[PDB]
Structure formats: structure tokens, C-alpha cells
Amino acid sequence: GSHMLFDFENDQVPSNIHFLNARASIETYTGINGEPSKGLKLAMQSKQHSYTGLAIVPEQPWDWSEFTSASLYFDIVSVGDHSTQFYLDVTDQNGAVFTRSIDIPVGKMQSYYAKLSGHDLEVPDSGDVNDLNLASGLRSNPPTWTSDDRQFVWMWGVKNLDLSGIAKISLSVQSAMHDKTVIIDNIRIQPNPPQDENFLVGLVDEFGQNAKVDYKGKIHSLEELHAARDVELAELDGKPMPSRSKFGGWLAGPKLKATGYFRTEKINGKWMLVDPEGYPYFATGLDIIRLSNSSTMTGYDYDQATVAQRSADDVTPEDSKGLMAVSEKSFATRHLASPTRAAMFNWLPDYDHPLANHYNYRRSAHSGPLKRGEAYSFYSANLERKYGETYPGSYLDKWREVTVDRMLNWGFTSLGNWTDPAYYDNNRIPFFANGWVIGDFKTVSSGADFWGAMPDVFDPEFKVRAMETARVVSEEIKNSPWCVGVFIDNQKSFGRPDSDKAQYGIPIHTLGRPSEGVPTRQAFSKLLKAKYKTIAALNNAWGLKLSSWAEFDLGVDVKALPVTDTLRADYSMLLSAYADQYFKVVHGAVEHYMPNHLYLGARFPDWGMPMEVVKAAAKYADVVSYNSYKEGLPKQKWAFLAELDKPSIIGEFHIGAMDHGSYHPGLIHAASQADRGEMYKDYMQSVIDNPYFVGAHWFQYMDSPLTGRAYDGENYNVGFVDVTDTPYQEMVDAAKEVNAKIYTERLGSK
């Protein structure tokens, strides 16, 4: 309990705690130890405001440099009907920040801690700036000691702050659908207990489950797995919810023009899809209906001469490739690259074991302790355990059939993004198709290109690649009426919302480059010459003194120029031209090979939707797609949709919990499985209420691997099914409740 910062026992709201869209007071409540105590009650006006919370800002930064192995603790409980996800941001005197987050249930108050130093922060990650994981290759670790306190979950930022000056501690609730209220008490620093040197050892049992924790629903033997199977199989009969048309549209509603394909139409002031037969349609369903992302790095590697190399022409990025069948020749050369990874697994099969076919090999990774290596899919292994093999790979066919039966039973109207192409002829439930434009075209920088530099969309090779991407999608979907539409790409790093530098990173970086060999720079220069005509008019506009356009075309540093209204207008126009060109080229390619199908945009995240780029999508995309990892769609955040007046779709959302073995709930956190389901209905209700949305897909079908998906270490409870391929009943029930009213509520009387 070493160092108490705030116990509120002096009955005052400290004046160095600042509050935003929240009321604070001191109240008596029953604390952890059973005794009455003074605590801070914080009532956030989070239904009305998309940012609320407190910020502790001491007059001088705290000097905690003596605490070389210590954590910051809070006692927290939610009050009322709703759990609370708090974002903890701690900022030091050099501006460096980390973010952690956790759910705060209603009910019994607990202690929560955020490491400041020591243990699994000591060697924090791989040293790569884009690696958000801990050194283990997990996005957030199990705790480094045993206790009743709850560890705030790692999200992103700097692992090792300058403890000689901590400048701000922030707790916030963001984009909520409801007012949230908490009591906070006993804000303190405690030295860390000794590190448990086994904390990363023996994490995973043979089913891929958390080995050390026995939770409700955990599988303890093959027989229990088969029992869960048989119970589910007896209930799945292939029957869609009542009053669905053939393509999952609404039978009981207006019947509109039938074109033979999914299309868009505004119905009584609300955007809808319309299915090939003319019935109103609203898209619900799950992303990642595939096994590509279900494998986890085992810590072994192969002799490179034994591994097939990637073709330069492949349209599929490594993260979305099928699980790679590992040969005997490769497996013979198996050696240990990460002792830390390898010691995580209580069981991996020998080359000759019947489950050894669920090995995978990844030739790259976005982040983690390994750049490449062997991986294993426990989920895939469990499909073999559940369904057996009556000819090679038969459990996969059975998986796909059970998957479509599930979606129909659960009331979903579609298979979501990243559905394996083997579902494309299921001819029982519609699906969404996808492609990625990748290749060797030139690139530009935005300043935040965490997944690779942005495409130079004016390079003719970009268009050659987009056409190849669309050709392959068209080949896959076979012009099917079951295909709702095509997503291309995902969350491209167009710009970030922080600042002018962040928003206009593409214009700014690009203007800095010479025109020669840079097609986007050439297009920007061409646009500025058309607007201004003369170098003197440009000089006047930007406050510069270039001698000529030729000097301008050697590259101009605009980083230190203050952003006048004139300068912002040129940056805005440049970003618009760039986004217009991206969308023109992708739209054109999709239209060329798939003239009948909806083009669904590029899936803008919350952090990557500058208005220039949205307006460009709205011009070319039939439906504008957004990813939104929030508790819902707040009113003010989405009010801009009315001006665009385009049908829109949520590509991705989720809510996770940690009561089913996971070390990380995911991006948005619930107090339990039940609370996950409640939060799902809250999110979906906001989608259903918004007249611009024609659907929302949940990311993803299955939990990520406990020890992290191979690509980048995400280890989240974000599935409708767990690693044993067993449904979370609470999500199933929430989905049924939601899917039963999508049509009646949206289209009905009020």
C-alpha cells in the first residue's frame, strides 16, 4: 500500500483533479475492507457527451523515479444499471502516453492496477514502434503475480514512461450510450510483488483453452466437447427466422423493384438494401468466417529452403492467406526460435499425430517477437475433434454447413467480410466479398502508416493492381446474386484526427518530395498550377518566395508553415484529389469486372475518416463503410451522415469479457458474458435507429487465440464461438433478440 495519493478522507474534491462532462462529489460508501469510507463519486454525462471523465494534473509533475518496480492502483466500482469501460491514459513530462482499459462492473468494489515499471514492462516489446504487444507477442499478458486485484488491460502507447515526471493521469468514458457512474477511492502506488517466472509458462491446454483457469463452459475432455456438439446439432435445422425471403430480405413489407442483385433504396426516409427479388434487406452477421486468423505462433521455425516463397503477383496479403499446409520436409527442420512462445503450450502434436495437419506457417507478421514461423490453429484442430474425418478435410465441409445453419438459426441475414470463398456458393445465406489492392506500385506517406506506406494512386501500376484484385473477386463470386457487395481494402491510413499535421500528413509529406518519380506529387503540382497559374500567386497564397514552378517541383517544406485558411484549403483540396483518385480507380475496377454488384467502400475506422476522404467515398461507393469500435453510434459523432445522405454500413464492432479464460476482452469491454450480450443490443439498437445505416457486422466469428493471432498478437474474447467451436449462448441470445426486430422495428409504424 506504500504510497497513498488520494483517499478522499478529508472530504474534499481535490482541486488538481479536473472533470469533463461529469459531476464529482465525496460520498460515504462501503469499501473493499467492509468499513464505510470516503470516496469520489463520479457521475459522467456520457449519454449526452462522447467524452467524459477526470484528469489528475498535479501542479508539478510527480517524481516517482524511485519506484523502479511498481504499479498505480485504484479502487473502483460502477453504480446503477451499467458497467463502465474506463480508459486510463497516463502522460509524462515529455508528452509520452500509454493507454490501458478495463470494464468496471456494478456490485462488489475491486482494486485495479496499472504497471508503471518492472516485470513485463522491463523488456517491453520487440523494439519496433508499430508493435503494440508485450514481449510475449500477446496484446495483453496474464498477470505477473497472483492476486485478487485486476490488471488494467494493455491497449497501446509507451510502455516505459519517464517516471521522474508524471504529468497527468486520466480516467475517461468515451462514446457511451448511457450515463455512467462510478466511485473511486484509494488512488495509490504499491511496489510490485515478486514476478512469477512461470507467468508465460503452460498457458494453453490441448483444446487451446486457458490451462490454468477453470471457467464456466471450459471443456475438460473430448466427451464434454462431443456433448456440447450433440446438443447444438440437435437444435440446428437449417430454418431461417420467420418471414425472411429467399435472400434474407423482409417478406412482410413493401415489395420493390427486383433487379436480380442486391441494391440500395431509401424506404420511408430510411436507407435500406433491397435483395435480388425486391424485398427490403438489412445486413447483420459476422466477419472472419474463415480459418486464416485462427493460428498462433508456436515459437518454432523451419529451414527457409523448405518453405514456398510468395509470388509478387499474389492479390492476397499474408495475413489473409489460407492456413499453409506444412510438409514433412519442412517439419523435419523444425528448430526453436522463441523459447518464450514454445513454453506457452502444454501440448502440440508430433508430425505423425492425426491433428498435425493444423500446423500453419506464416512468412511475415505485422508485430510480435517473431517475423515469421510455425503456427498452430487450435480452433481448426477442434473442428477435426468434433466432426472427424471421413475423407481428407471433411470436418471443414461440416464446419461450413454447421456455420450456415448457425447464422440462419441466429437470425443473421449475411455472412460478413472475410468469408472464406468456399461459402460463396452456399446458396442459402447472402455473403460479402472482399479484395485487397497490394503490389509493387509507388507509395506516399501520411505520417501514421502503421500497416505499410499508402498507395501512390496516381501510379499506373496501382490501377493495374486494382484491376487484378477485382478480376480475382469476380472470379470468386461468379456474378452470384447471393453476393451483397464488395469491400476493397480496410482501414487505410489516409490521415489521423489529432492535428493539422495528422490530418494532412499525405499533402504535407508529398509536397515535400520532388515531382520527379512521384506520380501523386505530379498530380498535386498540376492541381496547384491550375488554381494559381503563376508562381507569384502561389507565393502570395502560402507566404513563400519560390523563384519558379521548377523550384516548387523540387519539393517544398511546408511543415513549419502556420495553417492559414488559405493553406488549409489547398491541403484539403489535395487530400480530396488523392482520395477521389483512390476511389475512382477502385470503383472503376470493381464496376469493370462486377457491373451488377455494390461497391462497399474501404471501411473507415474512427481514427481514419477525414471528411475529405469520406466525401470521396460518398461519390464513388454505393455504400460507405465504417468500422466503429465503440459502445454505439453517438448522435453528434454521426450527425455528418445527414449531409452525405448515403446508405452506410458498420464493417466491424465487438464487445469482450474476461470471464471465459481470455487475457484481453478486446477493444470494447463488458463485465461478463451476460453484459457482452446486453452491450451488443445497445450497439445494434443505435445502428437500427440510425436512418443512414443498412447493416452492421460483428468482428468476429471466433475468439482470437489465447496466445495471440499470428499476424499481430490480438488475443481477444471477440467471438460468437470460443476456441472449442462452442457458441457463447449469451451472444447467440442477444443476436436472436436483435435479429428478430431489424425489419419490424426499422420499417414499422413508428
Ligand X SMILES: OC[C@H]1O[C@@H](O)[C@H](O)[C@@H](O[C@@H]2O[C@H]3CO[C@@H]([C@@H]2O)[C@@H]3O[C@@H]2O[C@H](CO)[C@H](O)[C@H](O[C@@H]3O[C@H]4CO[C@@H]([C@@H]3O)[C@@H]4O)[C@H]2O)[C@H]1O
Contacting residues toward ligand X, per CB under 6 A = 132, 156, 293, 319-320, 418, 450, 490-491, 605, 607, 627, 629, 652, 666-667, 699, 714, 716, 718
State yes or no: 9 annotated in a binding site: yes
For residue 179, the partner it binds in ligand X, Ca ion, none, with Cβ less than 5 to 8 A by kind, is none
Per-residue burial over 141-170, b if 16 or more Cβ lie within 10 Å, else e, is bbbbeeeebbbbbbbeebbbbbbebbbbbb
Nearer to Ca ion, 331 or 711 (CB): 711
Q: For the CB of residue 718, give the shortest distance to ligand X in the complex, in Å.
A: 6
Residue among 59, 31, 46 nearest 184 (CA) = 31
For residue 490, the partner it binds in Ca ion, ligand X, none, with Cβ less than 5 to 8 A by kind, is ligand X
Q: For the CB of residue 110, give the shortest distance to Ca ion in the complex, in Å.
A: 15
Q: Cell triple for residue 737?
A: 433478440
Residue among 723, 713, 711, 11 nearest 363 (CA) = 711
Nearer to ligand X, 38 or 637 (CB): 637
Query: HSE-up of 197 (CA within 13 Å, CB side)?
Result: 0
For residue 37, the partner it binds in ligand X, Ca ion, none, with Cβ less than 5 to 8 A by kind, is Ca ion
What is the helix (H) or strand (E) element at residue 341, kind and residue range?
helix 339-342
Nearer to ligand X, 19 or 450 (CB): 450
Residue among 405, 35, 38 nearest 234 (CA) = 405
Nearer to Ca ion, 30 or 445 (CB): 30
Which spans of this chain sit near Ca ion (rule: CB under 5 A)?
A: 7-9, 37-38, 185, 293, 709-711
| Rounded Cα gap, residues 254 and 250, in angstroms | 8
Nearer to ligand X, 347 or 451 (CB): 451
| Rounded Cα gap, residues 397 and 419, in angstroms | 14
Q: Cell triple for residue 274?
A: 433491397
Nearer to ligand X, 71 or 293 (CB): 293
Parallel, antiparallel or unpaired: strands 166-174 and 84-92: antiparallel
Nearer to ligand X, 521 or 660 (CB): 660
What is the helix (H) or strand (E) element at residue 73, kind and residue range?
strand 70-78
Parallel, antiparallel or unpaired: strands 335-336 and 300-301: antiparallel
For residue 7, the partner it binds in ligand X, Ca ion, none, with Cβ less than 5 to 8 A by kind, is Ca ion
Q: For the CB of residue 385, give the shortest distance to ligand X in the complex, in Å.
A: 25
For residue 491, the partner it binds in Ca ion, ligand X, none, with Cβ less than 5 to 8 A by kind, is ligand X
Q: Cell triple for residue 562?
A: 502556420
Nearer to ligand X, 405 or 714 (CB): 714
State yes or no: 37 annotated in a binding site: yes
| Rounded Cα gap, residues 133 and 366, in angstroms | 11
Place of cell 509520452: 96
Place of cell 506457417: 361
Q: For the CB of residue 14, give the shortest distance to ligand X in the complex, in Å.
A: 29
φ, ψ at 572 (rounded to 5°): -65, -40
What is the chain's Cα-based Rg?
27
State yes or no: 185 annotated in a binding site: yes
Residue among 202, 203, 197 nearest 122 (CA) = 197
Helices (H), 30-146: none
Nearer to ligand X, 132 or 477 (CB): 132
Residue among 217, 356, 231 nearest 661 (CA) = 217
Helices (H), 456-564: 460-477, 500-503, 505-511, 519-532, 535-542, 549-552
Residue among 362, 356, 357, 393 nearest 375 (CA) = 362
Q: For the CB of residue 5, give the shortest distance to Ca ion in the complex, in Å.
A: 12
Q: For the CB of residue 289, give the shortest distance to ligand X in the complex, in Å.
A: 11
Which amino acid makes up residue 447?
G
For residue 185, the partner it binds in ligand X, Ca ion, none, with Cβ less than 5 to 8 A by kind, is Ca ion
Q: For the CB of residue 186, give the shortest distance to Ca ion in the complex, in Å.
A: 6
Q: For the CB of residue 320, give the shortest distance to ligand X in the complex, in Å.
A: 5
Q: For the CB of residue 503, give the shortest distance to ligand X in the complex, in Å.
A: 14
For residue 605, the partner it binds in Ca ion, ligand X, none, with Cβ less than 5 to 8 A by kind, is ligand X
State yes or no: 122 annotated in a binding site: no
Q: Cell triple for residue 626?
A: 465504417
Please classify residue 217 by burial: count the beta carbons closer than 10 Å to its beta carbon, then call 0-12 exposed, 13-18 middle and 19+ buried.
Answer: middle
Q: For the CB of residue 417, give the shortest distance to Ca ion in the complex, in Å.
A: 15
Written in H, E and C, the secondary structure of 244-258 is ECCCCCECCCCCCCC
Q: Cell triple for residue 430?
A: 447472402
Q: For the CB of residue 711, give the shortest distance to ligand X in the complex, in Å.
A: 6
State yes or no: 384 annotated in a binding site: yes
For residue 320, the partner it binds in Ca ion, ligand X, none, with Cβ less than 5 to 8 A by kind, is ligand X
State yes or no: 38 annotated in a binding site: yes
Residue among 271, 284, 277 nearest 240 (CA) = 284
State yes or no: 551 annotated in a binding site: no
| Rounded Cα gap, residues 498 and 505, in angstroms | 11
Q: For the CB of residue 750, give the shortest distance to ligand X in the complex, in Å.
A: 34
Nearer to Ca ion, 375 or 732 (CB): 375
Nearer to Ca ion, 297 or 589 (CB): 297
Cα distances (Å, whole numbers) of residue 684 to 285, 391, 653, 674: 11, 41, 10, 16
For residue 629, the partner it binds in ligand X, Ca ion, none, with Cβ less than 5 to 8 A by kind, is ligand X
Nearer to ligand X, 481 or 608 (CB): 608
Q: For the CB of residue 132, give the shortest distance to ligand X in the complex, in Å.
A: 6
Dihedral of CA 392/393/398/404: which sign? negative
For residue 710, the partner it binds in ligand X, Ca ion, none, with Cβ less than 5 to 8 A by kind, is Ca ion
Residue nearest to ligand X (CB): 319
Chain mean position to CA 2: 38
Per-residue burial over 118-139, b if 16 or more Cβ lie within 10 Å, else e, is bbbbeeebbeeeebbbbbbbbb
Nearer to ligand X, 205 or 652 (CB): 652
For residue 714, the partner it binds in ligand X, Ca ion, none, with Cβ less than 5 to 8 A by kind, is ligand X
For residue 699, the partner it binds in ligand X, Ca ion, none, with Cβ less than 5 to 8 A by kind, is ligand X
Q: Which residues are annotated as a binding site for beta-D-galactose?
A: 496, 607
Q: Which residues are annotated as a binding site?
A: 7, 9, 37-38, 185, 354, 357, 384, 389, 496, 607
Q: Which residues are annotated as a binding site for Ca(2+)?
A: 7, 9, 37-38, 185, 354, 357, 384, 389
